[PDB]
C-alpha cells in the first residue's frame, strides 16, 4: 500500500518528464516491497526509454517471475531484446506472450514485426492479420501490414487500403500520437505533402525529446575559419560507410575535396564491415571517426563539436542506423540533409536539404521544412566511373547488328579484339563487332554449357553469370574485374528478337496504375517483354496474376534473380529501354541503368522520390525521356520500342552523355558541392539565418 503510493508518485514524476525522480521513486517502492510486479514493469519501461536496455532487462525478468501470467511483460521484454539485437530472444518472448494470452493483439503484431524484419513477409502478413482479427482498430498493425502488402505487390482492395491509411494518419496527427506510417514510406501512399512533412516532424521531435533529458546547453559555434587555417570543416555523418548504396554513390567524394579550402571529417555510425568501400573512405577523408564506438549521443555530439565542424551533413535521415539525436543536439552551426534520404526531415534542427531545381522546384518548397540548397545540375551522384570502368566501352558478337544481344566488356577488351582477324567497327565512340565464326562459337558454347570461363588467344573470357566464382570482390564492386566478361540475353532467358523493357527496382515501388501503364505499352509493341527482378521472389506470383488479369500472357514478363552489384549494372546493357516507376523512381537504380547506356522513361510526380529520375535525365541531357502524364509515358515508351532508328539515336545519346554530361563526374560534383558549402557558410558568417540557396 505504501509501495503502491510510491509507484503512483513515480508515475506522476514520470509523466511530468522528470525521469530521474521517477526512477528514484520506483526504486523506493521496490525497497519497501521487493515483489512488486508493476513497479518492476514500470521501471523497466522507463529504463528502456532512457536507452538503458541491460538494466531494463533485469526488471522485466523480475516481473515475469512474480506474475507468470503477465503476458504484457513478456511482450515488452521482447521489445527490449529486439532493440538489443537479440532476435531469437525477442521471438521467444513474443511466443511466450501469445501462449500465455492467445488474445493478445500487440504480441502478434510484435511477432509479425520479427518475421517482417527477417524478410519472411507471408508469416509477417499472417501474424498482422491475426492481430487485426483480435483488435480491428490497431494503427501500427494495419500500417505495417500495408507495407508488407506493398513489398510483395499484393493489391487486394488497394484503393480502400490507401484511403484507410490516409484516415489513420489524419487521426493520429490530430490526436498528437506518433503516426503509424513511417516517414521513409510516406511517399508510397497518397498522403498530402502537408501530412508527409508532419509525419517527418513527429520523428524529428522524438529525437529532440531524447536529447532534452541530457540537459545539455547549446553549443558555441565557430564564427569564422581562423582556427581552421581558412578551411571549412565539413562533417559527413553516415551509418553507410561500407557495402551499401550510399557508399556506391559517394565514396569518391571525400578524397576529391580541395584540402586548401576544406577539411573533411567522416563520422561513421556503423562498425567497419571489412569492405573496400570502408577502406576507401577511411583512407581518403582527412579525419575518420568511428562513432559506433561511442553509443552516448551526448558524448558523440561533444566529439563532433570539439572537432570544430562548420557544416554537418546528415546522410541518413530516417533510415536504418541513423542517429539523428546527434543533429538534434546541434553541434554545428549549419546542418544539411544530403543524398541518403529522399524526403524532408521535417525537423527544426536541419537547416538545408541539398537538392536541385528539377528534383525540388521552388514552387514546392512547402513540402520541406528545410531551406532548399540547389546543386546546379542534379543532387544525385554515383561512383560508376570509378567502380565500373570496364563498362565504359563494349563490343558485341554478331551471331546471325544488335548492340545488346551478346556483349563483351573488359579493361583489356581492345587488346583482345586486336588479336582477332575479322573485327568490324560500327560507327556510333565506336562499337566493335566480332563475326559469328570460331571464336564466337566457343563463347556461346561456354554460356550454353554453364562453363565458368575460357581462354582465347591467351585472354581470359569469363561467363558473366559466374563472377562470384572468379573474383568475389569484383562481383560486389569492391574491385574492378581483371578479366573480359561476356553478357548475353540467353543467360537470362530474354528473347533474341524482341524489345526488352526493364525495371530493376525492388518491387514495392510498383503500384496498380504503373503495372497498367506497362501492360498498355507491351500490348502496343508486339515483339516485347518486361524484365523485372525477384525483389523479393514472393512478389513474382502477384505481379504475374495482375498481368494475366490485364490480358498479358505469362511470357510477356521475364523475372531474374537479384544479382551481385557488378552483374546487376552490367546486365542493364541487355535491355533496350528502362521503364521507371512513377510512384518512387529508381535512384541508385536509375544511375545503374544509365551507366549501361540504357534510356530510362520517367514520369516525374510531386514528391522528391518521384522526381529523381527526371533530374538525372535532365542532367544527362535527355529531356525527351521525361513524360508529363501517363499517355506521354506510354507514347514515349512505344516510340522507343517501335521506331528502331529513333531507339538507336536515343541509346547513342545516353551512351555518349553518361561520360560527357556531368551526371557521373564526381570531381565536378564535389567542386559544385564545395561552391554550395561556401555559399551556406558566407550566409551564416554574415549573421543570417538559413534561406533558400537557389542561385
Amino acid at each position: 500500500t505504501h509501495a503502491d503510493s510510491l509507484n503512483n508518485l513515480a508515475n506522476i514524476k514520470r509523466e511530468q518528464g522528470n525521469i530521474e525522480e521517477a526512477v528514484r521513486l520506483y526504486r523506493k517502492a521496490l525497497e519497501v516491497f521487493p515483489e512488486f510486479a508493476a513497479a518492476h514493469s514500470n521501471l523497466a519501461s522507463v529504463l528502456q526509454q532512457q536507452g538503458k536496455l541491460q538494466e531494463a532487462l533485469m526488471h522485466y525478468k523480475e516481473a515475469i517471475r512474480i506474475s507468470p501470467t503477465f503476458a504484457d511483460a513478456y511482450s515488452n521484454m521482447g521489445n527490449t531484446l529486439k532493440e538489443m539485437q537479440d532476435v531469437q530472444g525477442a521471438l521467444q518472448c513474443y511466443t511466450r506472450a501469445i501462449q500465455i494470452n492467445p488474445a493478445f493483439a500487440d504480441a502478434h503484431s510484435n511477432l509479425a514485426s520479427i518475421h517482417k524484419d527477417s524478410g519472411n513477409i507471408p508469416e509477417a502478413i499472417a501474424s498482422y492479420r491475426t492481430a487485426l482479427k483480435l483488435k480491428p482498430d490497431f494503427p501500427d498493425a494495419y500500417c505495417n501490414l500495408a507495407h508488407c502488402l506493398q513489398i510483395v505487390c499484393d493489391w487486394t482492395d488497394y484503393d480502400e487500403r490507401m484511403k484507410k491509411l490516409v484516415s489513420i494518419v489524419a487521426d493520429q496527427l490530430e490526436k498528437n500520437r506518433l503516426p503509424s506510417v513511417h516517414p521513409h514510406h510516406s511517399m508510397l501512399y497518397p498522403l498530402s505533402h502537408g501530412f508527409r512533412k508532419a509525419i517527418a516532424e513527429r520523428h524529428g521531435n522524438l529525437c529532440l525529446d531524447k536529447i532534452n533529458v541530457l540537459h545539455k546547453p547549446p553549443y558555441e559555434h565557430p564564427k569564422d575559419l581562423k582556427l581552421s587555417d581558412g578551411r571549412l570543416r565539413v562533417g559527413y555523418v553516415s551509418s553507410d560507410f561500407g557495402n551499401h548504396p550510399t557508399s556506391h554513390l559517394m565514396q569518391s567524394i571525400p578524397g576529391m575535396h580541395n584540402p586548401d579550402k576544406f577539411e573533411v571529417f567522416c563520422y561513421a555510425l556503423s562498425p567497419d564491415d571489412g569492405t573496400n568501400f570502408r577502406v576507401k573512405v577511411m583512407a581518403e577523408a582527412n579525419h575518420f571517426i568511428d562513432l559506433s564506438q561511442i553509443p552516448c549521443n551526448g558524448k558523440a555530439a561533444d566529439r563532433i563539436h570539439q572537432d570544430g565542424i562548420h557544416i554537418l551533413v546528415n546522410m541518413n535521415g530516417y533510415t536504418k542506423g541513423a542517429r539523428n539525436e546527434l543533429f538534434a543536439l546541434r553541434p554545428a552551426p549549419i546542418q544539411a540533409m544530403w543524398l541518403g534520404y529522399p524526403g524532408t526531415s521535417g525537423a527544426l534542427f536541419m537547416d538545408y536539404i541539398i537538392t536541385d531545381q528539377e528534383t525540388s522546384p521552388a514552387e514546392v518548397a512547402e513540402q520541406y521544412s528545410e531551406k532548399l540548397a540547389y546543386m546546379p545540375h542534379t543532387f544525385f551522384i554515383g561512383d560508376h566511373a570509378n567502380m565500373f570502368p570496364h563498362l565504359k566501352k563494349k563490343a558485341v558478337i554478331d551471331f546471325k547488328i544488335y548492340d545488346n544481344r551478346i556483349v563483351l566488356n573488359g579493361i583489356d577488351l581492345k587488346a583482345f579484339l586486336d588479336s582477332l582477324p575479322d573485327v568490324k567497327i560500327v560507327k556510333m565512340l565506336n562499337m566493335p563487332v566480332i563475326p559469328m565464326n570460331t571464336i564466337a562459337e566457343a563463347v556461346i558454347e561456354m554460356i550454353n554449357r554453364g562453363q565458368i570461363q575460357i581462354t582465347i588467344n591467351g585472354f581470359s573470357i569469363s561467363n558473366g553469370l559466374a563472377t562470384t566464382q572468379i573474383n568475389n570482390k569484383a562481383a560486389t564492386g569492391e574491385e574492378v574485374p581483371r578479366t573480359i566478361i561476356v553478357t548475353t540475353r540467353s543467360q537470362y532467358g530474354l528473347p533474341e528478337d524482341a524489345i526488352v523493357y526493364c525495371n530493376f527496382n525492388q518491387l514495392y515501388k510498383i503500384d496498380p496504375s504503373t503495372l497498367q501503364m506497362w501492360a498498355n505499352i507491351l500490348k502496343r509493341v508486339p515483339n516485347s517483354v518486361l524484365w523485372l527482378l525477384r525483389f523479393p521472389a514472393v512478389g513474382e506470383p502477384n505481379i504475374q496474376q495482375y498481368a494475366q488479369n490485364m490480358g498479358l500472357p505469362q511470357n510477356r514478363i521475364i523475372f531474374s534473380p537479384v544479382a551481385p552489384k557488378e552483374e546487376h549494372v552490367r546486365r542493364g546493357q541487355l535491355a533496350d529501354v528502362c521503364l521507371d516507376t512513377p510512384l518512387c523512381n529508381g535512384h541508385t537504380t536509375g544511375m545503374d541503368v544509365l551507366w549501361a547506356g540504357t534510356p530510362m522513361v520517367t514520369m516525374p510526380g510531386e514528391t522528391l522520390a518521384s522526381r529523381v529520375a527526371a533530374s538525372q535525365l535532365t542532367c544527362l541531357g535527355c529531356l525527351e525521356l521525361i513524360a508529363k502524364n501517363r499517355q506521354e509515358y506510354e507514347d514515349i515508351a512505344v516510340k522507343l520500342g517501335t521506331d528502331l532508328e529513333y531507339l538507336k539515336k536515343v541509346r547513342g545519346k545516353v551512351w555518349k552523355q553518361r561520360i560527357s554530361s556531368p551526371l557521373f563526374n564526381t570531381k565536378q560534383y564535389t567542386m559544385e558541392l564545395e561552391r554550395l558549402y561556401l555559399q551556406m557558410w558566407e550566409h551564416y558568417a554574415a549573421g543570417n539565418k538559413p534561406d533558400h540557396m537557389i542561385k
Partner: peptide, 14 residues
C-alpha cells in the same frame, strides 16, 4: 542476391 547479400536503403525502427 541469393547466396550473398544486396544491401538496400531502408527505414529505421520505430
Amino acid at each position: 542476391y541469393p547466396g550473398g547479400s544486396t544491401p538496400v536503403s531502408s527505414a529505421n525502427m520505430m
